[PDB]
Symmetry: C2
Subunit: 393 residues, 2 copies
């Protein structure tokens, strides 16, 4: 909805003594449901999302080190100690340096040595937990009633589904209502998944993969960086010195490891929602309460015009925009015929029974013409609009 | 030099009728050369370096994108174009977007679209060419003459070598001279090698490895980043937009790919030189001009003292520092004996013929005592110093 603007589009016809029509809605796709003596119904999968997930952890991939302190003791003089050893925001390591007269000691041998450094995570990845019972999914539902493309967004009904809302109605005034009984298949995940976020990017990742990461992590909710040694490297001691270095930025390596994982985006307006770039919806569509309006309205006889010529949609259909100048409440007659003389229509009309509601209005018509050469005819009498069309595919 | 201060130490002795004796000097190691009736000569490999290598290339691992511009054209309206498409510091991409009435075009079908962005390398790795004949290497040469450790550095003779020069002398006052005829074996490779440096860290890498890196590169002199697409991703077009992104920082991945490669450091106060963390030097040592000083001295008869008690060096040797307050230009008798009464020496003296030149002088003596229990006896008479010693290792 509207399916004309969407490239990947499927037309579905049901038996018309058919009440339900099952259809599947995939991402970036759309479905036009057509039923005889019934208005056409565009449905499309808008979003499959997760509403405000619990941030479980943070995983540092960029860390800097400051205030490197070291305490050293000569052989047989005892075990070394630093005060920062009693501080969580410091990474420390304990070793033994080869010491003697060369480096200011009394005895030759192993001297205890400790090195500490202040750990600051510059950049981290957030890991959110995912509950299956948090999934909302959205379906656009719209009727073919001759609305101009500029009026599509305002005419679209947005149907939101939960683990509780699984049968939604779509009410189109004057045309009744349609009932969607839908069900989300979000591919896989859950009982073994995280929402991993790096700034603006987000993915669905495996929990065991994320917990086996050779990177420092942090809780909710704050606290301390766990396993800080994954980004801290202590070079072997020399006399009374130890070089402490932070490892390189692991952004690119992580992102490389995240190729193939399902993408996720957080949205900016407005709720912290996590839209999945996957999954699909299986719906049951009830069309019985859809009534074809133009329930009355004489048909407009007066000379009309093509505001927008018949154009190929790429869907095997054609779209037109016709203006009705002297047509106070009108019905637009539209036929597609093998030739002008034989008025035998063979075009299946998508915009079923089009209406010009107001004095001087412009209506959008969509028709599915037969293969080969044909004639798109709009109106009757001498002011019949004709437009020759060809179909290939 | 001094080999007592260096843990990894090898003793090499030459024959009596020997002028020349060959030895190999490795990094962080040291060699004590011993010759009968001749002072022991500590040699050590200090550095193997390259002075100002030629910068061959630059490889960007951190890139930012600015000034993202986009040009789009409707179907059958022609090819899209940006001026920035013909600018060198910009990454551009040419594609086709699915367009129609849905996104404000007149026809349904492909519309040509261009996306450009200003490319700025935030961080790059420098790649230097290295000339095999500019390798300079430095060797410390020092004699065992009883100098205290605080006077070691001042007594060390520093010998600088080049690719062709080649043969250096070490002249010690009172003890003659030694001649080193050395040759640097720098392991591998050169000619097909680069000095790759990131910030302060540096390595020796293969040229073809660096040229095959899936990263944007540049020819130093002047600036043009080639293959920007290795750090730029243009997501598939949607309507009239293409979002252009910089990839993540590739520092950690590069540093990981450089694990195992030989390390290099540039230093600050030998001034911007690239020391190899590898290679070794093979030398021929001429000892013929080495004279044992003070071999016509009288014996120290007088009460001496231990300024520094005999301590284990970790080399299986012991070091002592003895004061000679009253003795006048004499030589210090040093023996290690299985018993005090029969004072029969079984310790080989590293400090061959230690002498007290001035009264109240403190001499550093190193002895290789026999295994097990022994008696370190220094001097004669009732005031001969004794120190009972134990050896295992």
């Amino acid at each position: 909805a509207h399916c004309i603007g969407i490239t990947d589009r499927d037309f579905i016809e049901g038996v018309h003594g058919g009440t339900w029509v099952s259809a599947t809605l995939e991402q970036d796709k759309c479905v036009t449901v057509m039923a005889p003596d019934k208005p056409s119904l565009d449905i499309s999968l808008q979003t499959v999302a997760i509403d405000g997930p619990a941030e479980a952890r943070k995983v540092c991939y960029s860390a800097v080190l400051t205030h490197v302190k070291i305490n050293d003791k000569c052989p047989s003089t005892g075990e070394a100690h630093l005060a920062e050893e009693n501080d969580g925001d410091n990474a420390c390591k304990r070793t033994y340096s080869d010491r003697g007269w060369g480096n200011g000691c009394g005895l030759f041998g192993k001297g205890s040595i400790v090195a500490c450094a202040k750990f600051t995570c510059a950049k981290s990845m957030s890991l959110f937990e995912v509950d299956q019972t948090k999934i909302q999914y959205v379906i656009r539902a719209q009727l073919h009633v001759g609305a101009k493309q500029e009026n599509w967004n305002t005419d679209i009904k947005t149907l939101k589904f939960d683990a509780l809302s699984g049968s939604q109605e779509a009410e189109f005034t004057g045309y009744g209502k349609a009932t969607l009984e839908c069900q989300v298949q979000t591919a896989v995940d859950f009982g073994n998944s995280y929402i991993a976020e790096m700034e603006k990017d987000s993915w669905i990742v495996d929990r065991q993969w994320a917990q086996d990461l050779t990177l420092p992590w942090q809780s909710g909710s704050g606290g301390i960086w766990r396993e800080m040694h994954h980004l801290v490297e202590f070079e072997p001691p020399h006399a009374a010195t130890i070089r402490v270095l932070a490892l390189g930025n692991q952004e690119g390596s992580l992102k490389t490891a995240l190729t193939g994982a399902m993408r996720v985006t957080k949205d900016e307006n407005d709720n912290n929602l996590y839209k999945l770039h996957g999954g699909h919806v299986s719906c049951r569509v009830k069309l019985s309460a859809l009534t074809l309006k133009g329930t009355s309205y004489k048909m407009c006889t007066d000379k009309m015009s093509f505001v927008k010529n018949p154009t190929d949609t790429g869907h095997g259909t054609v779209v037109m925009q016709v203006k009705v100048p002297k047509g106070a409440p009108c019905k637009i007659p539209v036929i597609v015929a093998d030739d002008l003389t034989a008025a035998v229509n063979k075009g299946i009309l998508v915009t079923v029974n089009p209406i010009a509601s107001t004095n001087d209005d412009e209506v959008l018509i969509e028709v599915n013409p037969p293969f080969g050469d044909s004639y798109i005819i709009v109106g009757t009498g001498d002011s019949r609009l004709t437009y020759q069309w060809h179909k290939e595919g």
